[PDB]
């Protein structure tokens, strides 16, 4: 079966990883108190 | 303190699910040919 020409590679550079992890961890640090209540 | 018993799993999954998503994407970017 012939390959789909609409396929594209995906990227996340290191800075984006660090920015993303910061977002997730700080959001969890913020929301955790309310989850525990 | 009598905290909600689902607070721990809620927090752990809140952290782990998206962090893992990002880690997956980063590592597969690095492994691509340069």
């Amino acid at each position: 079966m012939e390959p789909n020409p609409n396929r594209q590679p995906v990227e996340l550079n290191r800075t984006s990883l660090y920015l993303g992890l910061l977002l997730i961890l700080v959001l969890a640090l913020l929301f955790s108190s309310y989850f525990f209540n | 303190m009598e905290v909600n018993q689902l607070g721990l799993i809620a927090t752990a999954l809140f952290v782990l699910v998206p962090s893992v998503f990002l880690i997956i994407l980063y590592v597969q970017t690095e492994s691509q040919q340069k």
Binding site: T15, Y18, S32 | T11
Partner: peptide, 30 residues
């Protein structure tokens, strides 16, 4: 358990600071 959770998240953040500073992608002039 809550305290462990809070301290854990905090510790991960400080670790992130470390990697983001010392193991950053080096800025390069092309």
């Amino acid at each position: 358990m809550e305290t462990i959770t809070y301290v854990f998240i905090f510790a991960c953040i400080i670790a992130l600071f470390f990697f983001a500073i010392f193991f950053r992608e080096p800025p390069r002039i092309t």
